[PDB]
Ligand binder design. Sequence first.
Ligand SMILES: [Cu+2]
Length: 229
Amino acid sequence: HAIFQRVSVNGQDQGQLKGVRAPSSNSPIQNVNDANMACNANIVYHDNTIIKVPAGARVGAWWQHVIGGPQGANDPDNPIAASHKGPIQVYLAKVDNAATASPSGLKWFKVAERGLNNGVWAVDELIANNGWHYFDLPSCVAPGQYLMRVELLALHSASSPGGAQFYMGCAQIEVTGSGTNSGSDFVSFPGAYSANDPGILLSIYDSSGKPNNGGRSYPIPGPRPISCS
Ligand SMILES: [Cu+2]
């Protein structure tokens, strides 16, 4: 359990909860067809900040166990429980106004993904970076208003149908710059994922119980991220 609550753009912190729609109370989604798979349920924090992100920028998304982080407490499950290994991905959906747009029934395209690399998951990197997930918004992304959905998929129980846990939230962004590419390989949320996808229904464990996926590659679910080639 963890909540996306803050964005950085090229190392500039945009402010706690600025432009990030967040619940205060996050259970995971475990049904890939849940209506709230886009931007999560029971949003409490929703301001009218629209974050300017240059195409090409390095974007940080901050996650903490609870809203505001531990504020000095020793939380072993901050930024997220270490057991919760999995990928982190980012999608965009174009909207007319990112402050006011509803998340339902949009067309999403993938702009970044990170999975498993030499036994290290994206979630491990998140933990190493104190809750920050970094990715590069590709330089070709067309300017305009978008919701930016950051999704963490925890696979510690994913060997059982329905056992995968999806954590997500949406930031309100305006992409600026010189890009012209609006996406190619679009999905619905819900609708992107099957519960039998091999990156959703799998054992990530070797025989000793190490969550290193046993030397197997991890097939990240969803469409391919856009390429600027
Ligand atoms: Cu959890």
